[PDB]
């Protein structure tokens, strides 16, 4: 569906926000980098890697949807 | 191993003025003396008034301020103790160490108005008094039936916290000037031009000869480093007829005091507190 395969900054902000809100609800981190003072640093170091537990589901104006995993997508 | 060797040579001294001429040191020493005099040499002055009957036309907090700024003799200043230290007291009343109290009281009971001057502040340590100079510093004027009665607590301070406590009416230095006239270009100029070179000097450094009618520096000290005589020369054409440049050792310092501390013992007192500063920043080992 998408040939550019580039993540928009808005989806990146959304996923970092939801990841920080998830890690701020008494949940362990997937990476072994615990000990930070703020959840923003944890979310940033988590998105800096490739192992992300959730993905994004894009929507099409025609009335359909296409799946795109974060593992195949690249982040700047 | 490396150490300068400054050398002083006083020119006038009085209890308020002093003009000494340091030679052989860097400006960075003289500036430091200035700066520290202006704002570390400590003095004693009033710092918590407590008023019981003001009836005057001026409100209370304009009597306070005015009182504090009054200059109070403080030879004992360096030997006291910043209150915030002294743990011999609750901070009220005389504490031989840290505070001295000054009661004042007045009520006009005639017709012609009564000037509550400063010769009407009475103290209880007979050291810290107000400085006397011929009538003193009016603190209020009272008309019949009006009264002021206050008790004040002086304290010791550094003029970097307020300037009530600062012992100088301007300390300042001047890189002494060095003036060289080309003396042969200056033979080129006609008489008139010279007398329009003389008189383009804001101050008076230069001056014509009676006889040979030559420009003869006649007071090197008075040259504010403006550029006027120089730039007039450029315009007249002849450039560098006169070149004047700072000597960069010799300074001429001029200290003047509020009266709290005699001038002499302002300088000596500065050098002393500088040493005590430096000797706290040694990193040992």
């Amino acid at each position: 569906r998408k040939t550019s395969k580039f993540m928009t900054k808005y989806e990146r902000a959304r996923i970092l926000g939801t990841r920080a809100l998830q890690i701020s609800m008494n949940a362990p981190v997937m990476v072994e980098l615990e000990g930070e003072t703020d959840p923003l640093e944890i979310a940033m170091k988590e998105l800096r890697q490739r192992k992300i537990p959730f993905t994004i589901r894009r929507y099409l104006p025609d009335g359909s949807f296409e799946e795109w995993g974060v593992d195949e997508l690249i982040v700047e | 191993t490396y150490q300068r060797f400054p050398t002083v040579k006083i020119r006038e001294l009085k209890d308020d003025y002093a003009k000494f001429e340091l030679r052989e040191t860097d400006v960075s020493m003289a500036n430091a003396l200035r700066r520290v005099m202006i704002s570390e040499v400590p003095t004693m002055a009033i710092h918590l008034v407590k008023i019981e009957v003001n009836s005057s036309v001026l409100n209370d907090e304009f009597i306070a301020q005015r009182l504090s700024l009054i200059p109070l003799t403080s030879e004992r200043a360096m030997s006291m103790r910043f209150c915030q230290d002294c743990e011999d007291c609750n901070g009220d009343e005389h504490c031989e160490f840290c505070s001295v109290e000054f009661p004042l009281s007045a009520k006009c009971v005639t017709d012609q108005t009564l000037d509550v001057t400063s010769r009407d502040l009475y103290s209880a340590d007979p050291t810290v008094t107000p400085v006397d100079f011929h009538k003193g510093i009016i603190i209020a004027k009272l008309r019949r039936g009006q009264e002021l009665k206050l008790k004040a607590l002086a304290r010791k301070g550094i003029g970097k916290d307020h300037a009530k406590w600062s012992p100088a009416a301007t300390v300042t230095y001047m890189y002494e000037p060095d003036i060289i006239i080309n003396e042969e270009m200056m033979n080129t100029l006609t008489d008139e031009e010279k007398i329009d070179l003389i008189e383009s000097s804001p101050t008076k450094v230069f001056g014509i000869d009676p006889v040979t009618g030559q420009v003869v520096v006649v007071d090197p000290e008075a040259y504010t480093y403006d550029e006027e005589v120089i730039k007039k020369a450029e315009a007249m054409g002849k450039p560098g007829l006169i070149e004047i440049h700072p000597k960069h050792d010799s300074f001429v310092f001029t200290v003047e005091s509020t009266g709290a501390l005699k001038a002499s013992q302002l300088v000596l007192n500065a050098i002393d507190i500088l040493k005590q500063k430096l000797d706290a920043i040694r990193l040992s080992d």
């Binding site: - | 918590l48 407590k50 907090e61 209150c83 915030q84 743990e87 609750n90 901070g91 009220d92 505070s99 607590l153």
Partner: protein, 44 residues
């Protein structure tokens, strides 16, 4: 210890000798700062 409305003195501190009045937590006679201090730092 003390009671509401008393006039005490700030013994040790940057604000030394100041007189203040104990609203509940003392308040100074002529400035707007409400400071709170323990008994050891207050005197009659």
């Amino acid at each position: 210890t003390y009671s509401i409305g008393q006039k005490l003195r700030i013994r040790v501190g940057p604000l030394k000798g100041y007189l203040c009045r104990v609203i509940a937590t003392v308040k100074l006679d002529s400035q707007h700062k409400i400071f709170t201090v323990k008994s050891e730092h207050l005197a009659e």
